[PDB]
C-alpha cells in the first residue's frame, strides 16, 4: 500500500554513481562559449587549494538590513602561480563529436612536466620528447606544417598548460598538465597566440579579475567506504533495533524482485568530481608583493599567509585567487577555476567588492594575533633567549 507519509527522497540522483573519480584532477566538461570578437584569452586556470580564512567588508546591497554595514565572510585561497604553455591541440567537428586532429608541443619541456609522462622517473632515461624536439632542428618545418593544419581545420583550439608545482610548498615535484580552451579571435589567431606563448608563462591576473564570478572544478575530499546514514542522509533507526540501526530498513518492495538503483546503499563517499559555480573573486593577489593580506583600510604590511603557515599547506609565495566561500576539494588538491559559463547579472554578481580586513591569525589553534609584531606588542618581552 501507499507510503502513508510523504517525504522527499534522500540524496540527488543526478550525482551518480557515487564512485571514485577517475583522476585526482577533475576535468572541465564545458568551456565558456567563444566570442570571436573578444581578444584571445584562456578560459580556465590551474591552481592548488591552500586553505580558508575570514574577511570583513562593507556590503553594497540596497534594500537589505546590512546595506553599507560590515559583514564577515569566509573565503578560500587558491595558490595560483603562472602556468606554462607547452602545447596546442586542434579539434575538428565531426558527426560523432569533437576530434583532436593534431597536437603541437613546444621545443623545450621542463622537468616538472616531463615527470608527468613517467611513473618511475628516477630510474628512467628521460627520453620524453627527445625525437619530437628535433622537429625544430633546421627551421621547424614539421612544426609549422602541423600548426598550418590546425589553422586550416580545427574549429576548436585548446592550449596545453602545466603548473609550476615547484613554486608550491608541495612535495609532489610533478606538474599537472591540462587542456584549457582558448577563446577569442579567429582559429588562426588562437594558433598564433598559442605558438607565441610556447615556453611562456601565463599569469592568473591575465585570465581572472576581481569581482568576477568563477566556477570551481575539483575532486571532493575522500572518506572511503561510508554507511548509508552519512553517505545518503537517511534516518537513523530506533534504539531498540536488532541487527543494526545505521541502515535503511526496507531496501525495496517485494516486486520488482530486485533492489532499485535509487535505493540508498553503503559505498564510496567523497573523491567525486564536482563543478561548483558562482563563486565571487574577492582578490587577485600577486606573490611578489608584501602586504598581500593588507587592504586600503588596514595598511598592515602583511601577506595573505596565516601565522604558522596555512595548515597542511604552507606559505603563499605566488599569485593567488581569493574566492568567496568554500569550493570542493581539500588543501593541496589541484583545482581548475573556470570562467562563468553564462553572463550573471543577479546583483549579487556585478557587485564591486572592497575588503576592509583579512584574517591572518593562526589556523593551528585559536589564534589571537594577526602578525608577530602585534604579538610582540601585546605580549611584551619573553624569556626566550636572544
Amino acid at each position: 500500500s501507499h507510503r502513508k507519509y510523504e517525504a522527499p527522497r534522500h540524496g540527488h540522483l543526478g550525482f551518480l554513481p557515487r564512485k571514485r573519480a577517475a583522476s585526482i584532477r577533475a576535468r572541465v566538461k564545458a568551456f565558456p562559449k567563444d566570442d570571436r570578437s573578444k581578444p584571445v584569452a584562456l578560459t580556465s586556470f590551474l591552481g592548488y587549494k591552500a586553505g580558508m580564512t575570514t574577511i570583513v567588508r562593507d556590503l553594497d546591497r540596497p534594500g537589505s538590513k546590512f546595506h553599507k554595514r560590515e559583514v564577515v565572510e569566509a573565503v578560500t585561497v587558491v595558490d595560483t602561480p603562472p602556468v606554462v604553455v607547452v602545447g596546442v591541440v586542434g579539434y575538428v567537428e565531426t558527426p560523432r563529436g569533437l576530434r583532436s586532429l593534431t597536437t603541437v608541443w613546444a621545443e623545450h619541456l621542463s622537468d616538472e612536466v616531463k615527470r608527468r609522462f613517467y611513473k618511475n622517473w628516477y630510474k628512467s632515461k628521460k627520453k620524453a620528447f627527445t625525437k619530437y624536439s628535433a622537429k625544430y632542428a633546421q627551421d621547424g618545418a614539421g612544426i609549422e606544417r602541423e600548426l598550418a593544419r590546425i589553422k586550416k581545420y580545427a574549429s576548436v583550439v585548446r592550449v596545453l598548460v602545466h603548473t609550476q608545482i615547484r613554486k608550491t610548498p608541495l612535495a609532489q615535484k610533478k606538474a599537472h598538465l591540462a587542456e584549457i580552451q582558448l577563446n577569442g579571435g579567429s582559429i588562426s589567431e588562437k594558433v598564433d597566440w598559442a605558438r607565441e606563448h610556447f615556453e611562456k608563462t601565463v599569469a592568473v591576473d591575465s585570465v581572472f579579475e576581481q569581482n568576477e564570478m568563477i566556477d570551481a572544478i575539483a575532486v571532493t575530499k575522500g572518506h572511503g567506504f561510508e554507511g548509508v546514514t552519512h553517505r545518503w542522509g537517511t534516518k537513523k533507526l530506533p534504539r531498540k533495533t536488532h541487527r543494526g540501526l545505521r541502515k535503511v530498513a526496507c531496501i525495496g518492495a517485494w516486486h520488482p524482485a530486485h533492489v532499485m538503483w535509487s535505493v540508498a546503499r553503503a559505498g564510496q563517499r567523497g573523491y567525486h568530481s564536482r563543478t561548483s559555480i558562482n563563486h565571487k573573486i574577492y582578490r587577485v593577489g600577486k606573490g611578489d608583493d608584501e602586504a598581500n593580506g593588507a587592504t586600503s583600510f588596514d595598511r598592515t604590511k602583511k601577506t595573505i599567509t596565516p601565522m604558522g603557515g596555512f595548515v597542511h599547506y604552507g606559505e603563499i609565495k605566488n599569485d593567488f585567487i581569493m574566492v568567496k566561500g568554500c569550493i570542493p576539494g581539500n588543501r593541496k588538491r589541484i583545482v581548475t577555476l573556470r570562467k562563468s559559463l553564462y553572463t550573471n547579472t543577479s546583483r549579487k554578481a556585478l557587485e564591486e567588492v572592497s575588503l576592509k580586513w583579512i584574517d591572518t591569525a593562526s589556523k593551528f589553534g585559536k589564534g589571537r594575533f594577526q602578525t608577530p609584531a602585534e604579538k610582540h606588542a601585546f605580549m611584551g618581552t619573553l624569556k626566550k633567549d636572544l
Partner: protein, 197 residues
C-alpha cells in the same frame, strides 16, 4: 550484382527500406546506407515524436543501464528498425548485421561511389500525395541527437565539391557524346545499328 551496395537514404520510408535491407543482408549482400538523417517516416512529426517518447519511457526499472537503450541518432533509429527484422541473437543474424553500415550524411569513401535508391521503399512512390510524413533528422534532434548542424555543414561542403565534379563530368560526357554522334552514319555504326547497338 555489386559487391557493396550503397543506398541513399533520402526520401525513403524507414520501415519499408528496413525490410529491404534486412532481406538483402540475410541473403548475403553487403549494404551501406548513407544520408540516414534524410529518411522519412509516414505520419506527422508529432505522431512520431509521441511514439519515440512512448519508446523512451520503457526502461529496466531497477537499473536503467541494463534496459532498452534509446539511441537518438537517425542511423541508429534506422538500425533499430532493421534489428527486429533480423534474428539478431543468432550467429546468422550477427553475420547479417555485420554486412551493414548506416551513416549520417555521406562520409568517405562513399562520397565518390554510386548511390542507389530502393523504389520499392521510396516515399515519393509509396506514400499517397497529401499524406503527412516525418524527416528522421528533425525527429532525432527533437529527441536528443546533437549533430544535425555539423552533418548539415559537412553535407553542404560535400555537395559543393560534388557539383564541381559533376560539371567536369558533364563537360566530358558532352565531348564523348559528340564524338559518338559524329562516328554514327559510318559503315561500322550502320552495321552496329542493324544489331540493336
Amino acid at each position: 550484382v555489386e559487391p557493396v551496395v550503397v543506398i541513399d537514404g533520402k526520401g525513403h520510408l524507414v520501415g519499408r527500406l528496413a525490410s529491404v535491407v534486412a532481406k538483402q543482408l540475410l541473403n548475403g549482400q553487403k549494404i551501406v546506407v548513407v544520408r540516414a538523417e534524410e529518411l522519412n517516416i509516414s505520419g506527422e512529426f508529432f505522431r512520431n515524436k509521441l511514439k519515440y517518447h512512448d519508446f523512451l519511457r520503457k526502461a529496466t526499472a531497477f537499473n536503467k543501464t541494463r534496459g532498452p537503450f534509446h539511441f537518438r541518432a537517425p542511423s541508429r533509429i534506422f538500425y533499430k528498425a532493421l534489428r527486429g527484422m533480423v534474428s539478431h541473437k543468432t550467429a546468422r543474424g550477427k553475420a547479417a548485421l555485420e554486412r551493414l553500415k548506416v551513416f549520417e550524411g555521406i562520409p568517405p569513401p562513399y562520397d565518390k561511389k554510386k548511390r542507389v535508391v530502393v523504389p520499392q521503399a521510396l516515399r515519393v512512390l509509396r506514400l499517397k500525395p497529401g499524406r503527412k510524413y516525418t524527416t528522421l533528422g528533425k525527429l532525432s534532434t527533437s529527441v536528443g541527437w546533437k549533430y544535425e548542424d555539423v552533418v548539415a555543414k559537412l553535407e553542404a561542403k560535400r555537395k559543393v565539391s560534388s557539383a564541381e565534379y559533376y560539371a567536369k563530368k558533364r563537360a566530358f560526357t558532352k565531348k564523348v557524346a559528340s564524338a559518338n554522334a559524329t562516328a554514327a552514319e559510318s559503315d561500322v555504326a550502320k552495321q552496329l545499328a542493324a544489331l540493336g547497338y
